Amino acid sequence: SNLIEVFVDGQSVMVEPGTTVLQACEKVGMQIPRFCYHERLSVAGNCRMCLVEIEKAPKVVAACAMPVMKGWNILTNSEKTKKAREGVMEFLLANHPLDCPICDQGGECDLQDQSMMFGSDRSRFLEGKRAVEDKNIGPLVKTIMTRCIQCTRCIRFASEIAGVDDLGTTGRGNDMQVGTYIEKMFMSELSGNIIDICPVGALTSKPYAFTARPWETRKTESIDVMDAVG
Amino acid sequence: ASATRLIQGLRNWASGRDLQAKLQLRYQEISKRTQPPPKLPVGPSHRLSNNYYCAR
Ligand code: SF4
Ligand code: SF4
Numbered sequence: 325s326n327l328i329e330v331f332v333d334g335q336s337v338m339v340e341p342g343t344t345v346l347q348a349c350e351k352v353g354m355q356i357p358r359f360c361y362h363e364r365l366s367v368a369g370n371c372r373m374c375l376v377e378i379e380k381a382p383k384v385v386a387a388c389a390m391p392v393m394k395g396w397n398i399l400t401n402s403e404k405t406k407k408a409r410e411g412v413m414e415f416l417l418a419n420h421p422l423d424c425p426i427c428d429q430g431g432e433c434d435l436q437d438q439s440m441m442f443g444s445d446r447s448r449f450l451e452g453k454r455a456v457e458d459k460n461i462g463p464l465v466k467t468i469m470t471r472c473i474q475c476t477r478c479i480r481f482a483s484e485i486a487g488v489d490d491l492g493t494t495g496r497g498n499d500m501q502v503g504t505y506i507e508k509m510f511m512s513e514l515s516g517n518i519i520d521i522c523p524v525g526a527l528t529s530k531p532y533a534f535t536a537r538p539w540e541t542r543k544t545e546s547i548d549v550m551d552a553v554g
Numbered sequence: 555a556s557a558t559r560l561i562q563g564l565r566n567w568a569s570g571r572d573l574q575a576k577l578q579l580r581y582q583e584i585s586k587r588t589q590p591p592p593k594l595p596v597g598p599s600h601r602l603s604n605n606y607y608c609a610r
């Protein structure tokens with residue numbers, strides 16, 4: 325009754341009619357590596373890291389936006405998939421600066437995590453490596469856009485949730501800059517949160533700056549004041 | 555060794571034949587230092603078009 329049997333590696337699971345592929349794999353413990361998808365943000369086909377093979381199907385389908393009909397069998401570790409992930413990771417790492425020493429997210433940034441635990445171990449493509457003019461935005465958000473993977477998260481957040489609608493993309497091909505075209509200050513309530521959503525070191529915290537580093541710090545549960553929302 | 559006469563006869567006469575590689579290792583055979591600068595090979599993989607990280 326409004327449930328669907330769909331196999332995962334031959335292991336059946338009952339899911340709702342219209343839950344996504346990525347969710348269906350979440351249910352049994354598969355977390356398909358991803359970038360542009362986010363729990364609070366509407367779906368987009370940008371990152372392409374979510375690719376996964378379904379047997380009997382010639383092309384690889386993107387797990388973010390693909391709805392699940394009955395009887396899909398989702399092979400996560402099938403060779404075609406792993407080759408797809410290695411590919412996507414390679415093209416992403418094609419144009420990226422080497423900032424990991426200076427970059428603020430070095431202990432965190434998902435390009436390093438998913439880079440080791442999925443993508444290939446050795447790069448290629450010598451002559452290359454485009455660069456981007458960096459753009460100052462707020463006093464809160466330090467901005468180096470060379471590290472941007474252009475994953476559209478910041479846009480979709482600013483639009484839907486923040487509601488400011490002042491961020492976008494301008495360009496084609498290699499050259500697409502993500503940010504205000506007129507060099508306007510972007511500041512709002514909830515705006516600072518964007519530095520958590522940027523998966524790479526493109527956006528970061530200006531005041532927190534260079535002081536710390538993720539593995540060195542001891543996380544501690546707490547509550548908030550200054551707002552009655554608790 | 556250093557110039558030795560009749561004492562090296564004493565040593566030839568006590569412990570037997572010697573004088574190959576005086577125990578002190580002090581005579582040449584020091585290799586100089588790196589006449590060529592080293593250049594190293596790189597083994598399997600390190601090559602485009604052959605491989606995907608899954609197989610290896
Ligand atoms: S954005 Fe990620 S991969 Fe790029 S320099 Fe920073 S930590 Fe390294
Ligand atoms: S600035 Fe960050 S969040 Fe925005 S598209 Fe680039 S990588 Fe994604």
Ligand code: FES
Pocket residue numbers: 358359360361368369370371372373374375386387388389
């Ligand atoms: S989640 Fe499917 S494209 Fe990024």
